[PDB]
Each structure stands twice: as C-alpha cells, then as structure tokens.
C-alpha cells in the first residue's frame, strides 16, 4: 500500500538557539570524527 507522493522541499530541522547576555555554553565533552573525501585526479 505504497505509492509516489509529492511534497514541498524541507529546509532542515528548525532549532532556535537560546541567546542571553550573561549566558554561555561550553562543551563538556568531545569526539574524534573521521570523514572520507574522493577527488578524481
């Protein structure tokens, strides 16, 4: 029971970052990410 559907392009998840004068955010942790790029020569 599946078919082709049409829809408007989504622009991505909307996330409103809080903003204040006396407020700040500092990372408490981190991570090591590895990415792959393929460039023809």
């Amino acid at each position: 029971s599946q078919s082709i559907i049409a829809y408007t392009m989504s622009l991505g998840v909307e996330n409103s970052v809080a903003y204040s004068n006396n407020s700040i955010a500092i990372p408490t942790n981190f991570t090591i990410s590895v990415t792959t790029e393929i460039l023809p020569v």
Partner: protein, 319 residues
C-alpha cells in the same frame, strides 16, 4: 547559477516535418550528445545552489528579545512582517537585477525552472545570519555553542592581534561605526544599480545566447528559403531533400555552436561557484586570516545576502 535552458533538436532544426525526420536518422546520435550536454548543464546549475547557499542542514532562528550590544542588524536580517521573506538589503539586490521567455519557448527553447526557489534561498541566508550572530564561529565546526555577542567580538579581535580591551572601551564607538557602515551599503546599492553588473552580465550572456540561437533560424544557409513548408511545396521530393539538407547542416552547426558556448560558460560559472562556496565557509562560518580574501583589512565577520543567480557577501574588516 545560470539560466537553465533545454533545446529540442527536432523542433529547432526541422519541425513538423516527417521527411526531414528521416533525413536526421542519417546523422546518428547528434541529438543524444547535444541533449545530454544541455541536460548536464541544467543539473550542474542546481548543484551550485546546494554547495553555496545552504552550508548546513540546521536552521537557526533569531531570539525575540534583541540586545546585540549596540549593533543594528534590522537591515541585514529578513523582515517577518513582509509577505515575501527578505531583508532590507536583499530588497534592493532583487530589484536591481533584471515576455522574452514565452517568445523563445515558441521556437523550441525551454527555460527550466530552478530546483531551489528564491524564498528557500532567503531561508538559508537567514539561517546563516542568525547562526553567525548567536553562535559565532561555533556552529560551523560542530554543535552550536551559546555565546553572548559582546564576547564574540572579543575573540574576533584577539585573532587579528587586537586585545579585547579595545572592544569594551570602544563598544559605543564601534557601535556607531558599524551601524553607519551598514547604512551606506543600502544607500550605495539604491543609487548605483551597476554594482550588481557582475550578475547582470550573466543574464545578458543568456539573453544574447538564446536570442542569437533563434536568429540563426531566419538565415537560409545557402538554400532557397528558410521555411520548411516552402521547400516541400515548391521543389519535388527528390529535389527537396537537397535543400532541406542545407538547412539541417547549418542549423546543426548553429545548435552545436550554442551547446559549445554553454559548456564553456558552464565551466566559468562553476569556478565562481566554488569560490563562493569557499568564501561562504571560511569568511562567514569561521574567521580567516587570509589577506585580500574576506576583504581588504583584517577580517572580522562576513554576512551573506541573497541575490538573483548569485550571492552577495557583506564583509566587516578592521582598518
């Protein structure tokens, strides 16, 4: 990006002709190579919009209570009260860049609509503006870190060799220098409409190429008449195949000439798109110490703006 055009080989060379359609079979795949070349251009036009306009997949918004420390961003930020989402500067950027479309579509020249609408372009711009304001340099290299904008200018001055003490003391002086400089941008773009001429040359290049491609049809190319119904109604079918072949060879070279010029202009517009994609990441998201890249002087911040068939960068430097 450039205007996406799709030209049918049949209707451009000889339309509404069954005898000529059989004469085209003797020239083989010429339609396939000319159609895939023009199709590949239209695909690359949408790839330039994904690599430049939208840098990130996360949409950022502006908080309702605005205290920026004395800077006025109302001109660079979009106005939600307007029916179409745009800023005060983008209002001029769209108006200063200029039916011929329907007239050319009658001869077989199809203008393909762009995948990315101008309203979605303003959303990617507003997302990068609201992110640079609230998140500073953090949203580009990872998760968005909340920082007050007053402390964001301190780090941007420490990067160019200026101790942050100059910021807190000149905070009122810097507030007047920035707000007055942004006001000069709207006044310069309103009075001078030739500052966008780099984009107007792209529209003029497509206009001259499409119009000249149609003007080639009026030439007889050494034949008796350029009209197909004339040759069929005048010379016998054995004699008509000679005159029609004269129109085929000429219009084939005229169509291959247009495709060749568009493939050359496609390499120039992708080179400018890669440069725009580089400045979008280094000047806007982060802070680059490169000279004569993010603009003359010691770079601080960069504000992208939406423009027809392009993008406008607002660079703030320390002179």
């Amino acid at each position: 990006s450039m205007t996406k055009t799709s030209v049918d080989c049949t209707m451009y060379i000889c339309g509404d002709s069954t005898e000529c359609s059989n004469l085209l079979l003797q020239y083989g795949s010429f339609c396939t190579q000319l159609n895939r070349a023009l199709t590949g251009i239209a695909v690359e036009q949408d790839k330039n919009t994904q690599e430049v306009f939208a840098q990130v997949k996360q949409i950022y918004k502006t908080p309702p209570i605005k205290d920026f420390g004395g800077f006025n961003f109302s001109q660079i930020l979009p106005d939600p009260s307007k029916p179409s989402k745009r800023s005060f500067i983008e209002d001029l950027l769209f108006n200063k860049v200029t039916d011929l479309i329907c007239a050319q579509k009658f001869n077989g020249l199809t203008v393909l609509p762009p995948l990315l609408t101008d309203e979605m372009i303003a959303q990617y711009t507003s997302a990068l503006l609201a992110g640079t304001i609230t998140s500073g340099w953090t949203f580009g290299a990872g998760a968005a870190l909340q920082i007050p904008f007053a402390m964001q200018m301190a780090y941007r001055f420490n990067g160019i060799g200026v101790t942050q003490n100059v910021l807190y003391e000149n905070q009122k002086l810097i507030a007047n220098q920035f707000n007055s400089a942004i006001g000069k941008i709207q006044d310069s773009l309103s009075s001078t409409a030739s500052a966008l001429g780099k984009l107007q040359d792209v529209v003029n290049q497509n206009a001259q190429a499409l119009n000249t491609l149609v003007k080639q049809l009026s030439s007889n190319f050494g034949a008796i008449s350029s009209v197909l119904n004339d040759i069929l109604s005048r010379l016998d079918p054995p004699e008509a195949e000679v005159q029609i072949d004269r129109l085929i060879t000429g219009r084939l070279q005229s169509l291959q000439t247009y495709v060749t010029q568009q493939l050359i202009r496609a390499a120039e517009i992708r080179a400018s798109a890669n440069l725009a994609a580089t400045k979008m990441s280094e000047c806007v998201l982060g802070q680059s110490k490169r000279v004569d890249f993010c603009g003359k002087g010691y770079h601080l911040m960069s504000f992208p703006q939406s423009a027809p068939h392009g993008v406008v960068f607002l660079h703030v430097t320390y002179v």
